[PDB]
Amino acid sequence: RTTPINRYRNIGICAHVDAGKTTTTERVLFYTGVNHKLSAAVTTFWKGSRGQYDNYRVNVIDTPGHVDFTIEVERSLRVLDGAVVVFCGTSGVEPQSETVWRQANKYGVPRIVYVNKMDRQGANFLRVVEQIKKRLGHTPVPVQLAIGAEENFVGQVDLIKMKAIYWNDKGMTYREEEIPAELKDLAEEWRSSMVEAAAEANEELMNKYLEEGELSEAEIKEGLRLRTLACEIVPAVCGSSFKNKGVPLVLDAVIDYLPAPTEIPAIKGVSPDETVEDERHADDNEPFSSLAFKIATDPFVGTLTFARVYSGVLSSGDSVLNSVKGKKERVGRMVQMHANQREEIKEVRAGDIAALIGMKDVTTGDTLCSIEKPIILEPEPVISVAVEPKTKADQEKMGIALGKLAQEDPSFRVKTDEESGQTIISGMGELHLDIIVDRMKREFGVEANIGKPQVAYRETITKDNVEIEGKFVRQSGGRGQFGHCWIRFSAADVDKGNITEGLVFENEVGGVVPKEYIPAIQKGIEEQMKNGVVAGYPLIGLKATVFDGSYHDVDSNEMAFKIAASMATKQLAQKGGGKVLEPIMKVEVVTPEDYMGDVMGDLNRRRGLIQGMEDTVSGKVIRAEVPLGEMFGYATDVRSMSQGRASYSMEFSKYAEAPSNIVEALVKKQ
Amino acid sequence: XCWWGXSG
């Protein structure tokens, strides 16, 4: 070995919108790079803000800056052991940050909080703390308080030591000064909350807190560390990364509250030879297992492959298994990306990050494991759009590309609705799809224009046994056209609520209409049926029975009969009871209790109607019959009300009549 | 006509 596992920190800097992840990373590397002297993964060292701890290996992991890359973001949560979740003193708890925090709960990632940009206008640390408490549902525990509002930003009050921290230039050297009187009264209030939150860790500490009414600084970091790992609390810290004031203390909290590879549950994988689940404990003696997280490429050096080791040791020259595929790869040269240098390594132990230079087939999310003892370690779309090429000719090669892109990207979906002549491409973000279309426009050639999906409205009749006459007479191009038929139309069969799809055609003619012209009548009706009688939308189905009609042997032909049948079927616009229909979805909302009031009333803001309500762990499960039209942007509107906590499922349920405000505007469209 | 499931 080299450095002991307990001295390792595999962390991720989770920051999204107005957080300043880019600055916070450059800073982390800067402070660590200097402090020590006295890319996808950045191997650094931290001895302490005031050199107070032992030398630790903090493995700064790149987390994605967009929630639309769900797979990349779910994986980064497995590559790290603990999270440094960055917020903006201003913005605070945004919808973007809510989603990562929810998937983090899914993997149970111990976290600490960084409330960056305390310098920017409208920034207040405690407001964000209430937002973390009230909207993120964990238990935030401030270990610091803030000095100065916006422009007034000097530093932090370390609530454990109870000495106000001011900064000295480049914000690495700090002044352990005193709490100013204005803050003295508040620091007490928050310190008591922290000491109490630390006290409820183990029974030992509660009896010591109950003795005096306090605990030692070491007994405070003990309690706060236990519940951090237990995923019961999030220690909070504030600062300004760009204005340098605060980044070393954050790195300390990483040392203090975040776990080492052993202090998290053993990565649960699957038996390669999948119906069985085996697992690997962060142990050198456990058979080797790791996952590849970033396949980068340097021009001179070659193809890098960022690999987080979970269990065992791997040395330059080893021959492993790519368990995903089945292929056996041989491990070549290895390195570890530092702040600026590329440091050449020989072996890589459990719970560490090394780069595999020049490798054969090693895809992202690939398990590299022990040949002898093997294991393999490694979603519903949110947004859907209507796609079509700029020039109608392209059409076949659009579906070739999209079909391939959906096979390349599993987080991307393609489906066609033929009755509406629509291709529906879907995924995780407006962004995700803007990128996919862009890739099709370039790397595939098919230029395509995207639009909001159109509602596939259908049509129906109500009046049964309606006998309509179709009379076609046109005198053109040196010929006569004669078509004459009477057809009796009955309404399409209904369940309960479900309408029977298709045309039910019958022949009730005594012999006035010839034998050979009859199929042309079916074709005419069918043609009209898909051309639409009311507002020009296909009819769901129809009962149609021809029974009368004269003919002129010379001027009468199949096409004249096709026309007269369509002429008759069109007249159902007045003589039929032409009801326009709309798709009705079988929706299911899983909401926590608070949000149930908002959600339930929003389903009614969508003409939706309640078909049952169960009681679950956190809240309600509401089953509802809601029109697809009113379902526009649900995944988002729902992630809004539930504060990113709810989930919804849907499927098509039936067809039902549409409202007059919709219908009348659909007939005015004609 | 409206989502990933085609349906409608």
Numbering used by the authors:
A (entry chain A): 3 to 40, 65 to 195, 198 to 301, 303 to 407, 412 to 528, 530 to 543, 545 to 705
B (entry chain B): 1 to 8
Lines from the paper:
The argyrins are natural peptides produced by myxobacteria and actinomycetes that have an intriguing antibacterial spectrum of activity. By inhibiting bacterial and mitochondrial EF-G, argyrin B blocks an important cellular machine, which is conserved in prokaryotic and eukaryotic cells, consistent with protein synthesis as a target of many natural products.
Since argyrin B clearly bound to the P. aeruginosa EF-G protein encoded by fusA1, we sought to derive more detailed information regarding the target binding pocket and possible mode of inhibition. The structure of P. aeruginosa EF-G1 in complex with argyrin B was therefore determined to 2.9 Å. This may stand in contrast to the characterized inhibitor of EF-G, fusidic acid, which binds at the GDP/GTP binding pocket and interferes with the post translocation release of EF-G bound on the ribosome. Supporting this mode of inhibition, argyrin B bound purified P. aeruginosa EF-G tightly, whereas fusidic acid binds EF-G in complex with the ribosome. Hence, argyrin B may constitute a new tool for the study of EF-G and ribosome function.
